[PDB]
Design an enzyme around this catalytic site. Structure first.
Site, short mmCIF file in Angstrom:
data_model
loop_
_atom_site.label_atom_id
_atom_site.label_comp_id
_atom_site.label_asym_id
_atom_site.label_seq_id
_atom_site.Cartn_x
_atom_site.Cartn_y
_atom_site.Cartn_z
N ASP A 75 0.77 -1.19 -0.16
CA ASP A 75 -0.22 -0.05 0.00
C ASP A 75 0.97 1.29 0.03
N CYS A 117 -3.45 -1.81 -13.40
CA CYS A 117 -3.27 -1.97 -12.05
C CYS A 117 -4.52 -1.27 -11.54
CB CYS A 117 -1.94 -1.05 -11.27
SG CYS A 117 -1.60 0.41 -11.76
N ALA A 122 -5.38 2.47 -11.15
CA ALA A 122 -5.55 3.74 -12.02
C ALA A 122 -4.85 3.31 -13.34
CB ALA A 122 -4.64 4.72 -11.42
#
EC number: 3.1.3.48
Length: 279
Positions: free
Chosen positions: A183, A215, A217
């Site tokens: 993250d 992914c 975006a």
């Protein structure tokens, strides 16, 4: 030998800042627009308001046009080492763009999908599941997706073998999914991502169909994967010139898909990966 590049190799911080400055200048003064993605009928088809495909390189869908489907998907072509359209960089599909994602895969004859995110990351939805589960085929519009096999290649990479059926034809599509991209930051080492690219290339084989890379975006991690593969193709074809510039590769990528290689940490990770490939 030109892999000389290593002999040449805060420097990387400055270099990434220059990529950002040059790509921003190109957005401002170059042939760069986002007309299609901002059309009222398409706005809902974008996962993120600040990520719109550049018109100049956008994927124009035609499959099912006669049945009234739109030409729009949030995705862009990226040129490969032979100047051909070697990658399609796209976002993780939404519930209402699942059908469009499969139109993309079918229309362009995609054999391998590389997915560099999870469905949910740190409590946020990042991609809809578009693959089937065991004994649970997925119907998305006119597409029926069946799971043939799942295989962990290593602790970080899943390989799914899919059967995709549309209009009385069935195709094999392989999906590779990176399962642990953090993250915050980048993977602990490049090894497993390199393994992913190596396997994608074995499955792709010869022939010009684009790799489908995404992914959430379709920008940062997607741009890392496309760049690693581009550089690896140069290496394997003995086409790394003595003035090889990773800067120039990434800048060129940024002019084809917005924010390809989004962060300094990604750029450093890409450097680490390329150095390792060059040994």
């Amino acid at each position: 030998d030109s892999a000389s590049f290593l002999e040449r190799l805060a420097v990387l911080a400055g270099e990434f800042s220059d990529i950002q400055a040059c790509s921003a200048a190109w957005k401002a003064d170059g042939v760069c627009s986002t007309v299609a993605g901002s059309r009222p009928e398409n706005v809902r088809k974008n996962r993120y308001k600040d990520v719109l495909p550049y018109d100049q390189t956008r994927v124009i869908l035609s499959l099912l046009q006669e049945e009234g489907h739109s030409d729009y998907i949030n995705g862009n072509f990226i040129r490969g080492v032979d100047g051909s359209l070697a990658y399609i960089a796209t976002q993780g599909p939404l519930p209402h763009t699942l059908l469009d994602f499969w139109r993309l895969v079918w229309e362009f004859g995609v054999k391998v999908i590389l997915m560099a995110c999870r469905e949910i990351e740190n409590g946020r939805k990042r991609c809809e599941r578009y693959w089937a589960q065991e004994q649970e085929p997925l119907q998305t519009g006119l597409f029926c997706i069946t799971l043939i096999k799942e295989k962990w290649l290593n602790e970080d990479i899943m390989l799914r073998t899919l059967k995709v059926t549309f209009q009385k034809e069935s195709r094999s599509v392989y999906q590779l999914q990176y399962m642990s991209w953090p993250d915050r930051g980048v993977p602990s080492s490049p090894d497993h991502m390199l393994a992913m690219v190596e396997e994608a290339r074995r499955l792709q084989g010869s022939g010009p169909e684009p790799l489908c890379v995404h992914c959430s975006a379709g920008c940062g991690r997607t741009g890392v994967l496309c760049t690693v593969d581009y550089v690896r193709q140069l290496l394997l074809t003995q086409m790394i010139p003595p003035d090889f510039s990773l800067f120039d590769v990434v800048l060129k990528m940024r002019k084809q898909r917005p924010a390809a290689v989004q962060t300094e940490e990604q750029y450093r990770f890409l450097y680490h990966t390329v150095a390792q490939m060059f040994c």
